[PDB]
């Protein structure tokens, strides 16, 4: 402790200088001779009603037609986004939930919350009912995110400064990712499913390694808590949203910040972030009751999605870019286009 | 109709699900939810028991055919600025303070101020439970307390002669009780804007009428909600 704090600071200064030496041009200037998208206007194609309390999470299905939503009255609902039918309505054991996830195959769903337990439900069962198939426990804090890898592998992110790679068949952690010094709020899987990034309340994001369990990289550009994170479709960049009232883009290869999307009027905090299929549109929910759309290459806002009367919680673009669904705290889902 | 023989059955299934959701909505509306806070020495476990690695605990109790669910966190870290946003649609926040220990009174005052001034808890109304009254009375009447050591402004405080209800108690303890309640109420009324009210109380360990004060304050909260709905207050 005597000289360790000095060596750590010297190494941090070395890292900062190395990052400075590899920044000759800014993305603001290289992407200056690009035609702007003008104005992207979207309209509510569908309005899904039926939740009693605020909506805390949503996840699109892999077929771009089904979706799942989690509410604070203790209900998951699996909709049919084309005809607004209710395919499934699953009651929960603990009514304090902040996350939900759809399996890539479509057989399973997952939900977690304030009871420090991640529950895996089996949809495609005989007897025609949805029953809980696994209750993964072992976290010492509330569960803030969960994302499937296969039908037998799921990555969870909790509020005890940890992430975990589980094994649903046997039901115990196979890997634990540690290194954060605050609540971890969101994670985003890589397209190839070999890495993932995680943002925490200590104003930092970290790029991990699923198979080894190490912490490959650390990004520190924000100045407050981080609420949402998302991968670029290429898999070599990711966007982060904070209570800073700013959004940021980070590069895995250049290992530094690329662009910050902000506006002097906005003083609220970002709650959700998603990308478009081509990566030319960054969508970001907000605390002032309405979403936003940013040109991800030139940092000028080019669209607003104002249809909610309360805080916007969740937001996610579908796989083929058909629609965009945004949930919020007044219990209504809205599929735009 | 332009619907197949199977999409009609899908629609019928959706309608059955909607009917079940309506029943669940009735059941969800009929009940009131409370959030219980407090430190380790506050004795909130005694209040929990007086109502006849898991991250939350829930207890159920009913009075006058009204159902209450009380939640308290049990295994979360001490940061509280991210899992407190979930409790913004609750009826009330029960707050428990140990008033006999003046070493930690400022910490409790800071906790109450931070809860009161919260951005998402800006409509919920607190129900203050000043606990351990017998301990405070004994420690004051036995001397060697010197409340002025921690609060310098207690050397020039006089009891509010207008409102002095006490069923045969020593006049020295009354000054201390009303000083503590005055501190908490001053924090309450410094910035309230008239949207939520603090309801202070005085409780012991063997007190039995703790399930009725909750009911009375909840009824008053509901009445104020109705008055605000009809634009009378």
């Amino acid at each position, epitope marked *: 402790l005597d000289q360790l704090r000095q060596e750590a600071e010297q190494l941090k200064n070395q890292i900062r200088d190395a990052r400075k030496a590899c920044a000759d041009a800014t993305l603001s200037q290289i992407t200056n001779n690009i035609d702007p998208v003008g104005r992207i206007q979207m309209r509510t194609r569908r309005t899904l009603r039926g939740h009693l309390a605020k909506i805390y999470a949503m996840h699109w299905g892999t077929d771009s037609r089904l979706l799942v939503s989690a509410s604070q009255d203790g209900k998951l609902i699996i909709w049919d986004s084309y005809t607004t039918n209710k395919v499934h309505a699953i009651p929960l054991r603990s009514s304090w939930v902040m996350t939900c996830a759809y399996a890539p195959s479509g057989n399973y769903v997952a939900c977690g919350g304030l009871d420090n337990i991640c529950s895996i439900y089996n949809l495609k069962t005989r007897e025609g009912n949805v029953r809980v198939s696994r209750e993964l426990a072992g976290h010492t804090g509330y569960l803030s995110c969960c994302r499937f890898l296969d039908d037998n592998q799921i990555v969870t992110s909790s509020g005890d400064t940890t992430c975990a790679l589980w094994d649903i068949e046997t039901g115990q952690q196979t890997t634990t990712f540690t290194g954060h010094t605050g609540d971890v709020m969101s994670l985003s899987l890589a397209p190839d499913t070999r890495l993932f990034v995680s943002g925490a309340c*200590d104003a930092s994001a970290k790029l991990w390694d699923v198979r080894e369990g190490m912490c490959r990289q650390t990004f520190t550009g924000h100045e*407050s808590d981080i609420n949402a994170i998302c991968f670029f479709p290429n898999g070599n960049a990711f966007a982060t949203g904070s209570d800073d009232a700013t959004c940021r883009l980070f590069d895995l290869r250049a290992d530094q910040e690329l662009m910050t999307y902000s506006h002097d009027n906005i003083i609220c905090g970002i709650t959700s972030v998603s990308f478009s299929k081509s990566g030319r549109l960054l969508l970001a929910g907000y605390d002032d009751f309405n979403c936003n759309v940013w040109d991800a290459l030139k940092a000028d806002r080019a669209g607003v999605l104002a249809g909610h009367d309360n805080r916007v919680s969740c937001l996610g673009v579908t796989d083929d870019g058909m629609a965009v669904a945004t949930g919020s705290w007044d219990s209504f889902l809205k599929i735009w286009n | 109709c332009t619907l197949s023989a199977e999409d009609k059955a899908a629609v019928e299934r959706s309608k059955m699900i909607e009917k079940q959701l309506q029943k669940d909505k009735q059941v969800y509306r009929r009940t009131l939810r409370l959030l219980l806070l407090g430190a380790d020495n506050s004795g909130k476990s005694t209040i929990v028991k007086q109502m006849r690695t898991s991250g939350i605990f829930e207890t159920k109790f009913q009075v006058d055919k009204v159902n209450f669910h009380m939640f308290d966190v049990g295994a979360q870290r001490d940061e509280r600025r991210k899992w407190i946003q979930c409790f913004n649609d609750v009826t009330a926040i029960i707050f428990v303070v140990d008033s006999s220990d003046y070493n930690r009174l400022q910490e409790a005052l800071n906790d109450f101020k931070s809860i009161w001034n*919260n951005r998402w808890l800006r409509t919920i109304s607190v129900i203050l439970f000043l606990n351990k009254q017998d301990l405070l009375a004994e420690k004051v009447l036995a001397g060697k307390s010197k409340i002025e050591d921690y609060f310098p402004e207690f050397a020039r405080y006089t009891t509010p002669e207008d409102a002095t209800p006490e069923p045969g108690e020593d006049p020295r303890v009354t000054r201390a009780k009303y000083f503590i309640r005055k501190e908490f109420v001053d924090i309450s009324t410094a910035s309230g804007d008239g949207r939520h009210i603090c309801y202070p109380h005085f409780t012991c360990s063997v007190d039995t009428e703790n399930a009725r004060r909750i009911f009375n304050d909840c009824k008053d909260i509901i009445l104020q909600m109705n008055l605000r709905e009809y634009n009378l207050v």
Partner: nanobody, 127 residues
Framework: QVQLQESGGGLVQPGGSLRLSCAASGFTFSNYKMNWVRQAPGKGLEWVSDISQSGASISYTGSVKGRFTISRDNAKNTLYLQMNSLKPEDTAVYYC?????????????????????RGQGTQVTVS
């Protein structure tokens, strides 16, 4: 990255006067409600002083209500605490603990065990 350093303390006998500084960098100084906390040997973290964004609102912890005074300078990005007439109950480690989110009045858990936006600490002893 946010970082706070309070290299302003020293060693003085009772009845003397000290002054604690705080250099802040990595964030906009003008939107945050900075604090001043302290930890005594054998005891946990406790709150000492307060100050608002522009300096209009101030608050103290009673035991220092008549002695200490907290000020700030947003042009030089600094936070000062003038402390005089030190009592033997003031030997402790002082922290420049910040405030989680900007543009807010409430802000939680400033005196937690493991807080993120908080300085290293300065030890002051009176004897």
């Amino acid at each position: 990255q946010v970082q706070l350093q309070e290299s302003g303390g020293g060693l003085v006998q009772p009845g003397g006067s000290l002054r604690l500084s705080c250099a802040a960098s990595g964030f906009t100084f003008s939107n945050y409600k900075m604090n001043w906390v302290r930890q005594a040997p054998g005891k946990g973290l406790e709150w000492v002083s307060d100050i608002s964004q522009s300096g209009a609102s101030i608050s103290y912890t009673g035991s220092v209500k008549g002695r200490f005074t907290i000020s700030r300078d947003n042009a030089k990005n600094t936070l000062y605490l003038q402390m005089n007439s030190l009592k033997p109950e003031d030997t402790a480690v002082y922290y420049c603990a910040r405030c989680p989110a900007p543009f807010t009045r409430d802000c939680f858990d400033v005196t937690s065990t493991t807080y993120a936006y908080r300085g290293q600490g300065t030890q002051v002893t009176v004897s």
